[PDB]
C-alpha cells in the first residue's frame, strides 16, 4: 500500500517531465533504500555522485519530487491512523472508566471536576510552519481524496472520478511555486491562523462537546455539560506578540482585532437563518411569550427586503422565530458595523443596534433554551440551539482573545522618558525598591502622569500607541499582557501603570514570562515578592497567571537540566500561590519539537508536577502545530480529546511525587548535565565555527516563514532546526550521557535507583521516552556526511567526538528504559534530501557559483538570487522536504 | 425493518402524549392491517367506531400520528431505494451501451447528439405542494439521519448520537403546526422554489456533468462535454405566471427577478474566493500573461480591506489569481448592487463596475481555461474551474429565466381600450382578419400607439405595467411570454405589438398555450396560419416555441381521448414546423399526477411521437414535483439522469410509428371513450351533486398551498385531488371501459390487435401501464365508505354504477397488458386516514358542530374556525396525510 502513492505520483511526474527524470528519481529511491537497509555509508557518496550530474532545472525537479512524496507520505499516514483507529467497533470513555474502576472516583465527581475545568489553547504565529498556505489547501483536498479512497463503499465511477480528482490535485500542488517569494505580514499570519476556524474549529467544538455528553451518559450522568461551561477556549498571539518584531505595529493589532470580530459576526450570521428555520414550535413559557410579544410590538412593519428569507414581519404564532429574528437583526448590524469599521475608519451603524456584550447575544438564546426545556422539548434544545449556544459561549463576539507581549526593557524606556521629562530622576538608574515605591505612588495617586507634550521615540510611541489602541477597542477582544524578560514586580507594576495612564477602561491582566533558566530559577521568589505588595494582591482578585517558556531554557543549559528546572519552577510557583491564596494558572509556552518542550501533548501534561493545573491550563500552539492539530475534523477532535482527557486525569489521578533520593539525585545529575552541555557548546571556542558549517542553520531565514525581520544570541527555533535537519538532535540528548555515567559512577546502586525511577516517576519516564523517540529519528551518518562535505579537514574529529557522545548517550537511554512497527521507508526519501542538501550547501559556499519579465521554467523563478540560478531554490526545497519528512521544523 | 420507524416514532408519541394514545394508535393500525389483508368492509366501520370516541384534541393527535408515520414511510422508502440502487457494485451507461450495441450508433454520434441536446426544466408554483417548507426542512434532516443509519460503518457512539438526533428532529417536526394559517405570497412561492438551488441544484449540476464525462470516457470519448454546452437549463414561473392570479402584480415580478439575481451573485461570490486559492500556478500563455499584466496596471494599489482574504494587491507571480481577483471585484459589486436594488429602489454602484453580460463573466474564466490547457494543466482545468464554468453557463447572472403568462382576453381588453381611445373602432368586435391586418400595420409602422393619457383599468394597467417592468429589467432575466387561451395569430401579434410599444428593448419570445381539447385539435392549423404571416416568420428566426397543456385536456374529455389527441397535436405541429423550416420546441405542461399528464418522466418522454423533440425539450415541474425530484443529492442526480437519458434515446432510438389500423382503431376508441366520459360527468344532471358530497373536493382551498385566491368551470388540480383522496381515480380510467368493450364488440380480431398494440407501440404500452399503476393504488371500498357516510340514500346506486365501471375497466386493462414487491402496509395508515376523513367530513357538514391570546394546546390553534374547535384541523391533517401516503396531491 506504500507502493500506491509512489505509483500514482511517479505516473504524474513522468506525465510532467518525462521518463528520464522519473527513472533517475527511482534510482535515487533504490540507493536510499539500500542505505536505510544495509546502512553502508558508501551508499551516500554513491547517491551524491548521481546527484552531481543533474542539470540546474532537473535538481530543482528532484527536490520537488522527494518533497511532495514526503508530504503524500504524511497524508497517507494520517489517513491510515484515522481508519486504523476508527475500525475499533488514552481516550475519553477509557479515561472515565479508568477513573471509576482504578481510583474509585464517582461519576458526579468526574462531572463536577469536568464542569469547572478549562483548557485555553492559544495559537501563535511562530515561524515554524514551513509549507505555504496556498499548498496547504491542496494538501487538504488530497487527504480528502485519499480518505474517500481508503474505504470499501466505492462505486466504480466514484472511484474513477476520485482518481481523476486526486491526479489533478497532485498536478495542481506540483504546479505551484512552493517558495514564499516575500515574507508575510502579521495580518497574513493572523489569517493563516484564523482559517482553521471557518473550516474546522467552528463546527468541531460543538461536535466535541456532544461527544463529551455521550460519554457522560455512558457513565450514568443524564445531565449535560453546561453550554456556558468553559471546557475549551481559544486565544491568539497573531497580531499581538510584538517582542522583537517591529512589524507588529499598533495598527496591525487594530487590524487583527477588527478582522477576527468581522469573521465571528459573519459566521454567526450564516448560522442564524437556518436556526430560525428549525425553531418552528408554537409552545413557549409565559416568559418567552412576553418577550416575543415585546419584540412584535416594535416589530417594524416594513418590507425588510435586505434579507432573503423571512423578510416579512414574523408572526407571534412561532415565538422562537420572533426572538431569533431579533437576534438576526442585531447580527446583521454587528456584521455591517465591523465590516465598515474594518473597511473604513468608522461606521454610522448605531452601537445600540449591535451586540456589544458577550452575552447580550446569549440572553435571547438562553431564553429559547429555558422555554424549550419547560415545554418538554429538551431534545430539541440539545441540538442546533445547543451547538449555537456553545459556539457563542466559546468563540464570543471575536473568535479569539488576543494577547499582547512586549519585552520589559521597552516599558523601562517609556518610564525613563516619563521621569526624565518630569525632571524627577532616571527610572533606568533607579534601584528596584525605588521603582516599586514610585510605581505604587502613581498607581494609588489620582493625578495624570505624562501629557501630550512628552518627548517620545518611535519605540516609546510604539508601546504607548499600542496601549491607546487597546483602550479604543472592546475589552472582550483582548486577553493578557505578557511581559518578556520579566524579573521584578516593578516590571508588572510598570504595565499596570502604563495601562491605567493610557486610559485603558478595563485593563487586561498582566503576566510575566520566565523563559531563560536564570529567570525560572528565581521565578517563585519574584512572584512571591509581587504578591507581597498588598495593593497588587487586592486588585489581582485572587487569580494570577504567569507564563513559563520552554524554548530558551534548553538552549543555554542542558535539555535535562532545563526540563528538571521547569518542573521545580511550576512546583514552587504553586507553593507561592497557595501561600498567598491566589488561584495560579500557568501559561506553558511549549513548542512542537521536543527541543522547545514539545512532544505528545498528553505526555507533556503528565510530566507536569501534581496539583499545578487544578482545572486551569494554558498552552501555546506553535504555528506548524496549528496545522498538525486542526487541519481535519478527526485531527481537531483528537486534539481537544487529548487535552481535556489529560487535564482531567492529572486532576483526579495525581502523578506520584518524587522520593527525596530522586530529588538529590536529579540535582547532582543536573549539575553534571549542564557542565557537559556548556563544555561542548560554549567552552569549546571553535564550536560556533563548526556549527555554522556542519548545519544548515544560517540558511533558515531564506524560507520567509514569519514576519519577524554568537550562539547564546540566536533564537531557539533555528537552533533546534539546525540539529533536526542534520538528524543529529544534539540539543535533545547532549547532557544525558555525562549525567547518567556520573550517577552510576558515584554509586552502583544508583543504577537500581534509575531503574526504579523510570518505572514509577511520570516526569522521568516521559523525559527518557522522549529522548528515545528522538534517537529513533536520528542517524549519525548524516552528520558524518555534512562534516566530510562541509567541515574543514582540521576539526573533523570534533564532530566525531560529538558522534561518540551521541551513541554513548543512546546506550545509556535504552539502559534506563530497559529496551534493546516497520514504517522505515520514508527515511529513504529523507536520506535523498539529506545528501542533496549537503552537496547543494557545498556548491552554495563557493565563489564560482555566485552572482557578479515573465517566467516559463523553474530556473526563471528566482531572478534576484545572489547564488547560482538553480541553486537557492534547490536548497529551500531541501529544507522544506526534510522538515516535512521529520514532521517538525524547529 | 418496516417495524423500525413504528418503534421509534411510537416511543416518541408515548413520550409526548402517554401510553393511552399510543395504544389507540396501535389499535387503529391493527384494524387497518386486517382491512388491507382480509379486505372485509366491515372492518372500516369497526375502525370508525373507535374513531368516534376520540376527544377533540386526541383526534387531532391521531391524524398527526398517521400523517407523520406516512411521511417517515416516504423517507425510509427513498433511503431504501437509494441504497438498494447503490449496492450494485434506464441509466446513462446502460443507455450508451444499448445505443452502441442495439442500434449500431457510434460514440461520436452519441457525443455529437448529446452536445446539441437541451433540456429546459421550468419550476412552477402550482399549488400542489401540501407540506409546508418549515416541515420540509425537518424531513430533510430526518432523511439525512436515516441515510447515515442505513449503513454498516456506524461507530457505537456515532449511532447513539444519530439516535438522539433523529429523536429530537422527529420531536421538532411533530412540535410544529403543520397547517399554513395564511396562504403564501408569490415571493414566498419563489423562495420555496429557489431554495433547492443553494441547497442541491447548485452543486448538483457540475457533479452530473462530471458523471456524463465519465460515461463518455467509458465509451472511448476522451473529449469532455463543452462547458457552454446547454445540456440542462432552469426556468421559473414563480412570480411570472399571473393567469387567474391577481396577487402576482408587476411589483411581484420585479421582486422575484431582483431576488433571483441577488441569490446568484451571492453564490458566485462565495465560490470565487476558494477558486482563487486553488489557481496558484505560475505558468500561463502569452495571452493570459498580457491580460493579467493589464489588470495589474489598473491594480488599485490600496488597502482593499473590505475583503477578508487577498486584501493585498495580487502579484503577477500568480496570474490566474490576478484575473480571478478581478472577477471577485466585479462579483462583489454585482452582489452589492443587486442587494441595494432589492433593498432600496436604486443603487449608486456603477453598472460598468458590475457584470452586465451573461459572458462578460465567462470571458475571464474561459481565458483561464485556455491557459491551463495550453500549459499542460488540462486536469486542473477540468476541476473546480470546470465546475465553475458550467455553473456560470447554466445558471447565469440570475439563477432562472422567468416566464410571464397571461390569458389572451386581457391583451384583447388592452387593445380594445387602445382602439376605442384612438376612435378607430372596437378591437373586441373586430373579426380575426381585421385584427391581423391592423396589428401588422402597427408592428411595421413607426408611429407610437397609445400615449400617457390612455384610459386604463386596473387590469389594463396591470398588463401594461408588467410590460414596463419587463422593459426596465435585464433581458437575460426573462424567458418566454406564454399566452393562455391562445386561438389565433392575432393573440401572438397582440403580444409582439404590446411589447414593442411598451419600449421592451429586447422583446422576449411569445409562445401560445393550448390546453383545452378544442384548442389542441385546432392547434396545428393556427400555428401554420401564424407561420403564414411572412412578417412574423422573418422575425421568429427559424425557431418557435409552443406550449401544450395536459391538465385541462383530461378534464372535459376522457383521459384516453386527451392523451391520444395530445400525441396527434405534437405530431402535426412538427409537420407544420417542418413545412415552414422552423425549429419547433414544444413546452409540455405536465403535472405530477397521471390525471394531469404526470407519471414516470422517462415513460412520458417515451410516449411522445417520434421526431418531435430533436435535442430540444421543455417540461414544467409542478410545485410538489420540485421537492420530489430535487430535495436530495441522489434525487437531483436521478432526475437529470432520467431526463437527459430519455431525450437522448428518443433522439437516436425513435419509437415505432403507429400502423394505420392502429390510427383508425384509436380514433373510434377515442370517440367511444369521450361519449362514455361525458355520459357520467356531464350528461348525468345529479353528477355535480354527488361529486360535491362523495369527495373532499370543496375543502381543498383550506390547505392554503398557493397564492391564487359547475365542474366544467373548476381547476384540474382539485379535480384530480378529489378522486385521488377517495382513491377511486375516476378521471384516470373512466373512458377505457366502454372504449375497449366497443372495440372487441365491433370486431373480435381487434382483441388480437390490442394485444399487438400493447407489445409494440410505446405510447399505448405507457398509457395502459400507467392506468394499471393507478389501479394498483385504488380501492373502491373507500368510495363505498364515502358514499355510505356522505351521499344521501337516494343516489347511492349511482356510485355503485361507477364502482361497477371501475372494476369492469380494470378487468379490461389487465386483459390488454396480459397480467393477472410486497410493500402494501402503508395502505393501512392511509386507510385509517381515509376513515377519519370520511367521518370527519360527516361531522363537518352538520349544524350542531358549527359556530354561532396565546395557545398552549392544539385546540387553541384555530380560534377563527367556523367549524367546531377541533374539527377543521383534523380535516386538513387528513388531506395532508392521505396526500403524503399516495405521494401525490393533484
UniProtKB/Swiss-Prot annotation, chains A, B:
Expressed in all plant organs, with higher levels in roots. It holds the Pfam family PEPcase. It comes from the Eukaryota. Its cofactor is Mg(2+); Mn(2+). InterPro entries: PEP_COase (IPR021135), PEP_COase_bac/pln-type (IPR022805), PEP_COase_Lys_AS (IPR018129), PEPCASE_His_AS (IPR033129), Pyrv/PenolPyrv_kinase-like_dom (IPR015813). One of its GO terms (molecular function) is phosphoenolpyruvate carboxylase activity. The modification Phosphoserine is found at residue 657. Magnesium. Can also use manganese. It catalyses: oxaloacetate + phosphate = phosphoenolpyruvate + hydrogencarbonate. One of its GO terms (biological process) is leaf development. Keywords: Allosteric enzyme, Carbon dioxide fixation, Cytoplasm, Lyase, Magnesium, Manganese, Phosphoprotein, Photosynthesis. It is an enzyme of class 4 (lyase). Optimum pH is 8-9. Its EC number is 4.1.1.31. The keyword Magnesium applies. The active site is at residues 126, 555. By light-reversible phosphorylation. Activated by inorganic phosphate (Pi) deprivation and glucose 6-phosphate. Inhibited by L-malate and L-aspartate. It is found in: Cytoplasm. Induction: Upon inorganic phosphate (Pi) deprivation. Belongs to the PEPCase type 1 family. This is Phosphoenolpyruvate carboxylase 1. The gene is PPC1.
